């Protein structure tokens, strides 16, 4: 719990610094250091759920605090400050928890999906990592939590499927293939 | 009255394997009569008919796997290509006693190659349930918590235990397939 609090503390410290002085700030000691606590925090979270062996207990205790701490934080971050590894960290947990998380896709996709999509829908170049990861996530959800794609309204579903079209139009071989 | 008499006839013929082993046609006629009695709804008849059948199989095991005069195919084949039509009206335990009985026949085929094919088909019916329950568990492990599927896993196993008691070592081909 505390680890999530500090993660969120740093995540909000970084985003502000950027919002106040542009991307450039990322290129200096303190920020790069704060990025590290976040990334290792994510490594730890995903690195454990992977070798965990009690899906439900994991989905009922260690997942809900992720929502406000990491997801809605990733949402409120300025575009330049959002952590790509957030998406890939989440992708891994879906692969593991599978059906046990199918009911949280609504809450999750809200925060990350649309807001991330708007970062990668202008061209095919900017925010590379965000492209790659985003689709590893979408792949995972579709792969182990398909029922979710039915729960949501036709308007949202469409937005999802057209996002896939967008994937396989990419010139980055990996992104287009995942699509 | 007819059931009390038929049972005694079936008891007597069950005590003289020496006579059955010298008269295939009679043995054949007896076995088929037992297969018919296995759809009899009169009290006890089905227990009688199974007891006799396992008895006879044990003591005449060789005659079922080797081609007899007047035939062109080992009796086991007819039996295996019909397991379901014979045992469809039997209770759970009786079905186990039936599987144990055929198991003894299988144990007679000392020829490696053929015994292996016999074994694969012998355990084909129970395997379907197994294979089925297994794939679904590889999507949601909360299924191995389902009262009905657990009831089946029990009966499948129970069936697997009897077959093994009679087939012997060669049964390894099965155990290995699900171990």
Please describe what this structure looks like.
This is part of a larger assembly, with 2 copies of chain A (179 residues). Chain A is mainly alpha-helical. In chain A, 73% of the residues lie in helices and 0% in strands. In chain A, helix 1 (2-21) runs antiparallel to helix 2 and helix 2 (29-51) packs parallel to helix 5 (84-97). The radius of gyration of chain A is 16 Å and the shape is globular. In chain A, 30% of the residues are buried. The interface between A and B is small, with 4 and 4 residues. It is classed as gtp-binding protein/transport protein. The entry lists the keywords protein transport, GTP-binding protein-transport protein complex. Crystal structure of the HIV-1 Rev NES-CRM1-RanGTP nuclear export complex (crystal II).
Beta strand count of chain A: 0
Number of helical runs of chain A?
Answer: 10
Quaternary structure annotation: part of a larger assembly
Helix content bin of chain A: over 70%
Beta-strand content estimate of chain A: under 5%
Broad structural category of chain A: mainly alpha
The most extensive contact between chains is: A-B, 4 and 4 residues
The biggest sheet of chain A, with number of strands, parallel, antiparallel or mixed sense and barrel status, is:
none
What overall form of chain A do the CA principal axes indicate?
globular
Return the string of H and E elements of chain A. HHHHHHHHHH
| Rg of chain A | 16 Å
The first-to-last residue Cα distance of chain A is: 35 Å
HEAT repeats (chain B): 25-62, 67-104
Subcellular location (chain B): Cytoplasm; Nucleus, Nucleoplasm; Nucleus, Cajal body; Nucleus, Nucleolus
Modified residues (N6-acetyllysine) (chain B): 158
Family (chain B): Belongs to the exportin family.
């Amino acid at each position: 719990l505390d680890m999530l609090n500090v993660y969120k503390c740093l995540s909000e410290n970084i985003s502000a610094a950027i919002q106040a002085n542009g991307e450039m700030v990322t290129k200096q000691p303190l920020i790069r250091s704060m990025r590290t606590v976040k990334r290792e925090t994510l490594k730890l979270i995903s690195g454990w759920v992977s070798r965990s062996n009690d899906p439900q207990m994991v989905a009922e205790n260690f997942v809900p605090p992720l929502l406000d701490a990491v997801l809605i934080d990733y949402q409120r971050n300025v575009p330049a400050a959002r952590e790509p590894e957030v998406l890939s960290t989440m992708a891994i947990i879906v692969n593991k928890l599978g059906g046990h998380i199918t009911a949280e896709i609504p809450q999750i996709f809200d925060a990350v999906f649309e807001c991330t999509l708007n970062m990668i829908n202008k061209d095919f170049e900017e925010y590379p990592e965000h492209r790659t990861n985003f689709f590893l996530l979408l792949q995972a959800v579709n792969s182990h939590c398909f029922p979710a794609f039915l729960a949501i309204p036709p308007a949202q579903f469409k937005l999802v499927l057209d996002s896939i079209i967008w994937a396989f139009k990419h010139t980055m071989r990996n992104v287009a293939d995942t699509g | 009255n007819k059931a009390i008499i038929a049972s005694n006839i079936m008891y007597i013929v069950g005590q003289y394997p020496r006579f059955l082993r010298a008269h295939w046609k009679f043995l054949k006629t007896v076995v088929n009569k037992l297969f018919e009695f296995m759809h009899e709804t009169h009290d006890g008849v089905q227990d009688m008919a199974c007891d006799t059948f396992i008895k006879i199989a044990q003591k005449c095991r060789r005659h079922f796997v080797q081609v007899q005069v007047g035939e062109v195919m080992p009796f086991i084949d007819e039996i295996l290509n019909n397991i379901n039509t014979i045992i469809c009206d039997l209770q759970p335990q009786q079905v186990h006693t039936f599987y144990e009985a055929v198991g003894y026949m299988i144990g007679a085929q000392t020829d490696q190659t053929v015994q292996e094919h016999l074994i694969e088909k012998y355990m084909l019916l129970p395997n379907q349930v197994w294979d089925s329950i297994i794939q679904q568990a590889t999507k949601n492990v909360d299924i191995l918590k389902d009262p009905e599927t657990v009831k089946q896993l029990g009966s499948i196993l129970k069936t697997n235990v009897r077959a093994c008691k009679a087939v012997g070592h060669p049964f390894v081909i099965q155990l290995g397939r699900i171990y």
